[PDB]
Amino acid sequence: GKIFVSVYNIQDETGQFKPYPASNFSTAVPQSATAMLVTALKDSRWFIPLERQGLQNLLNERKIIRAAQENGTVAINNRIPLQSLTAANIMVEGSIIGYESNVKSGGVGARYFGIGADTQYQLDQIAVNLRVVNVSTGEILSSVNTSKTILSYEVQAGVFRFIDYQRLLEGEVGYTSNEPVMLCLMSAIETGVIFLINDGIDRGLW
C-alpha cells in the first residue's frame, strides 16, 4: 500500500538571484519545487501525492461540479461522483535552503607560440531540506538536508600565429557546458526523497 502525501509548498528560501549579465530579478534556483518534489514522490513507487498546490483551483472545480449536478438534470453518463478530498497521513514540507555560487572555481590554461588552450570550471552548490511531518500530531518525523554540486565548465582552444611571411592564421574552437540548476535541484530532491523513504523504513513507519 502507498502512503498519501500532501506537498503544500517547497519554498525557494535561498534568497539568491543570478549575477551579471543575468537579470536582477532572475532567481538562481527555480521557484518550481513542489512540482519537482511531487514528481519525485510520484516516481518513487511509495507515495501517492495529493495536489495541495492549486488546491483552490481544485476546490473551485469541485464547486462547479457540485453545482452542475445538484439538480439531477445532468446525464447519468457524464456526471462526476465527488467522494471527498483525500486526506494525507504525512506531509512533506521543505525548502531550497541555499545556493552558493562558485563554491569552487578554477581553471588551467596553457599557450605556447600561437596555439593555446584553456579550461575553466565553476561549482555552484544547491542544498534542499525536506521534512516529513506527521499531520496527526504536528511533530516533524524526519528532516534531511541534501546537497548537490552544479558543475559549469568551459574548454577553449585557439591559434593566432603567422603561417607565412604575411599570412595570419587566426582560429579557435570552444565548448561550454553548464549543468541545469533545475536538473541538479531535481537530483537533490530525489536524493532527499530516497533518504526520507529509507528513514521511514529504518524507524517504524512506512
Binding site: 559549469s152 568551459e154 603567422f162 587566426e170 579557435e172
Partner: protein
C-alpha cells in the same frame, strides 16, 4: 555560475580591445622574413 562561450578574437566574436594584443603578440613571434631581403 552560468558560463557563456565568448570568442576571444575580435574577428568572429566581438571583443575588440582584445585585438591590439592578439596582433602585437603575433608579430612579437613573427620569425618569417621577407623572401626578398635576407634571401637569394
Amino acid at each position: 555560475g552560468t558560463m557563456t562561450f565568448q570568442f576571444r578574437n575580435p574577428n568572429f566574436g566581438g571583443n575588440p580591445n582584445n585585438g591590439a594584443f592578439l596582433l602585437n603578440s603575433a608579430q612579437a613571434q613573427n620569425s618569417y622574413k621577407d623572401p626578398s631581403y635576407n634571401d637569394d
